[model samples]
Target chain A: MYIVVVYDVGVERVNKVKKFLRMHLNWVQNSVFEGEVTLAEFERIKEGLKKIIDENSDSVIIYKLRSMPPRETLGIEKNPIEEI
Target chain B: MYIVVVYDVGVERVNKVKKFLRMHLNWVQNSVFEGEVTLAEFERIKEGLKKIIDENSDSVIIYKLRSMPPRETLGIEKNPIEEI
Candidate 1:
């Protein structure tokens, strides 16, 4: 599973989050935030980010997606995620 | 960039890794683990994961792709990933 965090942060804050997320997330995307993590790792990242938000008055929304399947299939059958 | 870790571990070990990964990663595809990490946070995760590996006796291969750009564009600019 992965963590997908979306926020309405400012340009500078957004960029800061991006830089921070890049270090703790995966499949980085623009317009949205995506990160790959284990349960422990996710918690660590979340806590770290919490400090970031607490230090600033930025608007942020974070989602810990524990239901996303791993990978894109180019084959005969799609994983449970593709079906869902 | 994303941190991809692939390992030849036991059932229980793999599950542990998967569980560990799920907490800190995103868009996790099977077999291949992808975690979105920043240059700094990546180092933290790396250091933390090193401890995990040190405690285990499994064979693992880890890749931290720092040069990868974020996102998968369906059309227009294919981003740098598709072209690469």
Candidate 2:
């Protein structure tokens, strides 16, 4: 499955989650990430993220785009944090 | 189709974009939105956004999710800016 993870964790844990995601996905924007993952991998990623986010104050959105287009951009496209 | 729109426009235009989007989609998180629209409506929404953003400094990402799960949440789910 192809998953895009966008998060707004508390400052203390944001980087931790971002770094973990960066290890497994492409950092597309501030707190936003995208990449492909196997179903099992997605489950693993979710478990890792669940441990870092505060369920009452933070927000993490996982967008499951079954298919991805060639990532169209309107302005600056930063070098992705990682390549697939 | 269903779509999730996330953006990081310049501070000057962020609210403008956010407000515009609030008119058409659910504001699920800061700078993040999701909702459903017809293909034609989606095209119109894109055109509307194009007028309000700075192509050189702003970023708007549209996630086309063919189907949406029950919007699982890890933390607070704000009253969607708009109901679907």
Candidate 3:
């Protein structure tokens, strides 16, 4: 699962946000954070981001994408399931 | 640059399909194939899959998800663009 956000995310704000999430998430790729967090944790993350991006809403668009089969995964070990 | 399919691909068929795609795509991880491909190549690959998945219509659902930023990428070195 991935939470993707497109925002101006200036250096200071981004630094703060990343630091906040890092407490519970792993930086799977630069700007791409990942972890098998529970739903509660997920909500906490979203809320935190919302608070961080309160005023710069126009400069950003955020969306969370969850995968289903046929969803291609990148940079990982063997796939847990066979994707034909 | 990635193609993901979910099908009840049997061992023999999966082997054949893997080999077929290997000629044109690079296997990034198990069952996930990626590579830089032209539009023409994409069509050829689609056609080939249509042929291979002829009748097992109900066994799978394939969706091509093209990222429109805010789309978090995984496993890659850097996000190329910062995902907030």
Predicted candidate 2 versus true structure: per-residue lDDT over A1-84, tens digit per residue:
677787778787888998899888888877788788898888888888888677888888776656553443545554442344
Please give the lDDT score at residue B25 for candidate 1.
61
Quick one: best DockQ, which candidate? 2
Candidate 3 versus the native: TM-score? Answer: 0.37
Per-residue lDDT of candidate 3, residues B1-84 (tens digit): 434332334465667666766787554333334454566776776567656543432122222445431332222222234221
Q: Which ten residues in a row have the lowest lDDT in candidate 1 chain A?
A: A72-81
Top candidate when judged by TM-score against the true structure: 2
- Candidate 3 per-residue lDDT, tens place, A1-84, comes to 544332334566777767876786554323434454556776777677767654523133333556431333222312234321
Q: What are the per-residue Cα lDDT tens digits for candidate 2 across B1-84?
A: 787887878887788888898889877888887788898888877888988888867777776656563444567765542355
DockQ winner between candidates 1 and 2: 2
Identify the superior model by TM-score, candidate 1 or candidate 3.
3
Q: DockQ for model 1?
A: 0.02
lDDT of 1 by residue, A1-84 (tens): 565554434466666767787677542224244556787886776676666543334444444444442432221221133232
Model 3 score (lDDT): 0.46
Candidate 1, residues B3-81, lDDT tens digits: the string is 5554444466567666666666642333344556777776665465555543334444444454332432221221123
